[PDB]
Design a protein around this ligand. Structure first.
Ligand SMILES: C[C@@]1(c2ccc(/C=C/C(=O)O)cc2)c2ccc(O)cc2CCN1c1ccc(F)cc1
Ligand SMILES: C[C@@]1(c2ccc(/C=C/C(=O)O)cc2)c2ccc(O)cc2CCN1c1ccc(F)cc1
Lengths: 183, 183
């Protein structure tokens, strides 16, 4: 967990990955079926099981929607102007949240976000929304290595890591707007 | 502008510290916040790269960031005052939820031993992030790293500190959202 290397952290994350399911009622039914596979992914995040049930519940209640959003943004990346809710539910341009989702998707695309970098971002969201901080520092370590072992200079590595984490503020912002609509 | 010239430009741009029943409390807080907004606008004009932006882009960034800016400044003032919020030197104190979240942020920056130099960098990041811009944000990332390097942190600690700071901004954005909601 705190002893895992960069490669091992990515391997545990890429293999923890939930499947892509198929389909407001249609989106609610999709989101409910996605919840169950998210719980399974979360129990496979290194360090997450080393927390008590109530801390795990607290982290999932806060992160749930941002986790749905980031996966949606990722799977929609190679479909500009469209949100791929499911392979059978690709929606063209609550529309307030949708344009933000599209902008996050454009941003991730022009940055050329990698699958290994994505799964790292998903994990941080779950943990950020002493042990928790040590694991986050390990995910920070995991992130820099992928950029280092991609041909980026130490300056470009800190710049990409900044840009990536600043997108999480925008992801937090969309989840708040989403939670406002639901309640 | 160099990494050293950036910190100096920012530190000089710092706004002054202003002075200060639910309606009574809200009256005093709204009054202070409205006076602080005038100095925040003038501070924004001194942030390297901000005046290069169109007046339309300046308005949008400030409209988006204002409450995050009031909040980070509050958090930074309340740092060496545990369990209290330094709204003003004469004002050290259904809004307790946002208040307890602000106190947690204060404790976090205290734990982390946040430095004034880093604060002004975090404050500038918010203004540009919340709402060319990317190259300026990239310049503030270098600046934060250049300061972490000068304090004698290893390259590992340097990138771990960068991440630790930028993830607090997600929580700052979350606090502004709940606050904008209450207002
Ligand atoms: C459409 C939806 C969503 C998520 C949860 C629920 C549950 C409702 C309930 O419990 O009644 C419904 C829809 C979604 C669904 C599945 C998915 O993979 C990704 C996203 C992206 C974010 N999103 C969303 C939520 C609220 C908004 F205001 C705007 C967008
Ligand atoms: C108290 C207040 C605040 C900021 C803006 C206004 C504007 C009112 C209006 O426009 O009517 C009122 C209070 C504050 C005051 C001064 C300051 O330096 C920093 C902060 C940051 C946190 N904050 C806050 C806002 C909303 C909440 F729900 C909880 C807390």
């Amino acid at each position: 967990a705190l002893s895992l290397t960069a490669d091992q952290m990515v391997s545990a994350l890429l293999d923890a990955e939930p499947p892509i399911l198929y389909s407001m009622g249609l989106l609610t039914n999709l989101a409910d079926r996605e919840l169950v596979h998210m719980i399974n992914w979360a129990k496979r995040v290194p360090g997450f099981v080393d927390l008590t049930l109530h801390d795990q519940v607290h982290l999932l209640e806060s992160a749930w929607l941002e986790i749905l959003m980031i996966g949606l943004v990722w799977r929609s990346m190679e479909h500009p102007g469209k949100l791929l809710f499911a392979p059978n539910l690709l929606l063209d341009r609550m529309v307030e949240i949708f344009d933000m989702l599209l902008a996050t998707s454009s941003r991730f695309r022009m940055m050329n976000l990698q699958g290994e970098e994505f799964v790292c971002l998903k994990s941080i969201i779950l943990l950020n929304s002493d042990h928790i901080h040590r694991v986050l520092d390990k995910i920070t370590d995991t992130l820099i290595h992928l950029m280092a072992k991609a041909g980026l200079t130490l300056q470009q590595q800190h710049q990409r890591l900044a840009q990536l984490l600043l997108i999480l503020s925008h992801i937090r912002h969309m989840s708040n707007k989403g939670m406002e609509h639901l309640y």
